[PDB]
């Protein structure tokens, strides 16, 4: 039931979740665990959390109207990370690496 | 107050 | 063609390669890349490298005679990491976390 | 001379 574009988006998502990128993608696999990380202000600063497991369930649920909504969620995920953390944080470097993977594959969508 | 990644596990 | 024991060992290997443990297991997914990491002495100190992809190909190749040979390779992987790196290194903490997963599942083998 | 994990990528 997926468009040609969202089928391509689903393949981007599968790649971002693959062991190939695990070294920098793993903090985004699941929702940020503010409880385990003791980040008592995380849900005050980040009003709309996002992560790859959430993007996957929405894609599998056929909840994205077009490829543009898929991209908006992925970039929200990266944006929340840049918003919450100091620019020198290692998770910010990991987000930028994974975002480089995303933007490159997304731009090359036929 | 800073996020510590290894604290996830 | 696998024993009941090595079938259980194969399930341990599948778990160690799962996204569940990726945060600390990813440096062991593939052979240590001394070229990319510029570790010009790595193959002088580590005479017998080992990693999870190598354990997997041996298991798939039916190259382990028993569960004891499987365990010897997994512990070689951890041992090489403790041998090469300083004890305070983050990859040593990651090895100990993954080894805790391994030893616990291995000990509970029926 | 110390291993740097982020240098893997």
UniProtKB/Swiss-Prot annotation, chains A, C:
Domain of life: Eukaryota
Tissue specificity of this protein: Ubiquitous.
Glycyl lysine isopeptide (Lys-Gly) (interchain with G-Cter in SUMO2) cross-link site: 108
Residue ranges of every copy of the Bromo domain listed in the record: 1-109
Compartment list: Nucleus; Chromosome
Disorder named in the UniProt entry: A chromosomal aberration involving BRD3 is found in a rare, aggressive, and lethal carcinoma arising in midline organs of young people. Translocation t(15;9)(q14;q34) with NUTM1 which produces a BRD3-NUTM1 fusion protein.
Function: Chromatin reader that recognizes and binds acetylated histones, thereby controlling gene expression and remodeling chromatin structures. Recruits transcription factors and coactivators to target gene sites, and activates RNA polymerase II machinery for transcriptional elongation. In vitro, binds acetylated lysine residues on the N-terminus of histone H2A, H2B, H3 and H4.
Assembly and interaction partners: Interacts (via bromo domain 1) with GATA1 acetylated at 'Lys-312' and 'Lys-315'. Interacts (via bromo domain 1) with GATA2 acetylated on lysine residues. Interacts (via NET domain) with CHD4 (via KIKL motif). Interacts (via NET domain) with SMARCA4 (via KIKL motif). Interacts (via NET domain) with NSD3 (via KIKL motif). (Microbial infection) Interacts with the Integrase protein of Moloney murine leukemia virus (MLV).
Family per record: Belongs to the BET family.
Domain writeup: The Bromo domains specifically recognize and bind acetylated histones. The NET domain recognizes and binds the 'KIKL' motif found in chromatin proteins.
Protein name: Bromodomain-containing protein 3
Source organism of the structure: Homo sapiens
Organism lineage: Eukaryota, Metazoa, Chordata, Craniata, Vertebrata
Gene assigned in the entry: BRD3
Full-protein residues shown: 307 to 416 of 726
């Amino acid at each position: 039931k997926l468009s040609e574009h969202l089928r391509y988006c689903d393949s981007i998502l599968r790649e971002m979740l693959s062991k190939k990128h695990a070294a920098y993608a793993w903090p985004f696999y699941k929702p940020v665990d503010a409880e385990a990380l003791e980040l008592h202000d995380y849900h005050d600063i980040i009003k709309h959390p996002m992560d790859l497991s959430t993007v996957k369930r929405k894609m599998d649920g056929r909840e994205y109207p077009d490829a543009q909504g898929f991209a908006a969620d992925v970039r929200l995920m990266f944006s929340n990370c840049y918003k919450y953390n100091p620019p020198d944080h290692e998770v910010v470097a990991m987000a930028r690496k994974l975002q480089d993977v995303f933007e490159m594959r997304f731009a090359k969508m036929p | 107050h800073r996020x510590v990644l290894r604290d996830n596990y």
